[PDB]
Design a binder for this molecule. Structure first.
Ligand SMILES: Nc1ccn([C@H]2C[C@H](O)[C@@H](COP(=O)(O)OP(=O)(O)OP(=O)(O)O)O2)c(=O)n1
Ligand SMILES: [Mg+2]
Ligand code: NA
Ligand code: NA
Ligand code: NA
Length: 313
DNA sequence: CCGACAGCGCATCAGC
DNA sequence: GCTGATGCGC
DNA sequence: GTCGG
């Protein structure tokens, strides 16, 4: 709360730019400024003081000046009381409903969850699911449940074929006490960079009633919903399964471990050290992909190997 | 003044 | 029928 | 929106 007023303002502005203005880069810019200010071990007294921090420019400095001089931001106060802007912003909290669909819905007088429920025919499959589990999808998953979820995935995966390898990634692998969802990386000897693997795994997870719904499903990427077996019922949870080639495991596990800001900074720094890095390979006009552990990637771009727990940014 | 800020996989829409 | 663009969520 | 070409 040292600079909580400021960081709250910037985060709120960020969401507006993403959900209403449809400006993801302004969203990212506001998020970046909020993040650096949250690390600043001082009580900010002026916009010029905040201006010194990387990610804080002239506009945010001006906004901070107004906030420190009035206790509020007129632009934000007006946004909050705007019915269409607030409705658009809220509807995007439904999975499957982005800035475009939210705006279209609000233009049609559809502004609430109640409105969505009585207009189900106007929703696609993904949106219907996002609406059905609206509350559950905004719940956090305690690591203990993540462990129980991991146990089921790992057990059923081997039950299909012992050659499969499944690894839970993302926040869980970064050792978070709670996660927003579950991210699973899957590999098999049959699928390499040069040469129904995902389908069989998904089918088995459905057979034991772990997976309850499907948002999207192709040959390499699954997005769906899962639930632990009950005793009170556990909330439904979001789960992704990604099938990547086995000879590209290290780049894959690195990317899906994250975090998103961390990956964003790794891509940037790689570009400086004369590298380009994706979820598949890392290349030196680019060259041929290099042989790879995770530390190897850090070594190419000249970085000390940070454990997953230190990859928040 | 002005473009990058990564871009992928899947569902769905737009159009031949 | 198809290819490509767009929206969406990573 | 900020940064840097
Ligand atoms: N815009 C994004 C979103 C995600 N990721 C990567 C890093 C993440 O770790 C991983 C999985 O995405 P999640 O949304 O699940 O993020 P987390 O698992 O890290 O956190 P959460 O607990 O909210 O699920 O994909 C990325 O590179 N860029
Ligand atoms: Mg996750
Ligand atoms: Na600055
Ligand atoms: Na949404
Ligand atoms: Na996820």
């Amino acid at each position: 709360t040292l600079n909580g007023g400021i960081t709250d303002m910037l985060t709120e502005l960020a969401n507006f730019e993403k959900n209403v203005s449809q400006a993801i880069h302004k969203y990212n810019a506001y998020r970046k400024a909020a993040s650096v200010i949250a690390k600043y071990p001082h009580k900010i007294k002026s916009g010029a003081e905040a201006k010194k921090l990387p990610g804080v420019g002239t506009k945010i400095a001006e906004k901070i000046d107004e906030f420190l001089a009035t206790g509020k931001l007129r632009k934000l106060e007006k946004i909050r009381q705007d019915d269409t802007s607030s409705s658009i912003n809220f509807l995007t909290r439904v999975s499957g409903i982005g800035p475009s669909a939210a705006r279209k819905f609000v233009d049609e007088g559809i502004k609430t969850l109640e409105d969505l429920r009585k207009n189900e025919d106007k929703l696609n499959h993904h949106q219907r699911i996002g609406l059905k589990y609206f509350g559950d999808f905004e719940k956090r998953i305690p690591r203990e449940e993540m462990l129980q979820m991991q146990d089921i995935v790992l057990n059923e995966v081997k039950k299909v074929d012992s050659e499969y390898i499944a690894t839970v990634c993302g926040s869980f692998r970064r050792g978070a006490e709670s996660s927003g969802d579950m991210d699973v990386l899957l590999t098999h000897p049959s699928f390499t960079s040069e040469s129904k693997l995902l389908h069989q795994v998904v089918e088995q997870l459905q057979k034991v009633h772990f997976i309850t719904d499907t948002l999207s499903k192709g040959e390499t990427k699954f997005m769906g919903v899962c639930q632990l077996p009950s005793e009170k019922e556990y909330p439904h949870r979001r789960i992704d399964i990604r099938l990547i080639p086995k000879d590209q495991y290290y780049c894959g596990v690195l990317y899906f471990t994250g975090s998103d800001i961390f990956n964003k900074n790794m891509r940037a720094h790689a570009l400086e050290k004369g590298f380009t890095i994706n979820k598949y390979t890392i290349r030196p006009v680019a060259g041929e992909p290099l042989p790879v552990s995770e530390k190897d990637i850090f070594d190419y771009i000249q970085w000390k190997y940070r454990e997953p727990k230190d990859r928040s940014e």
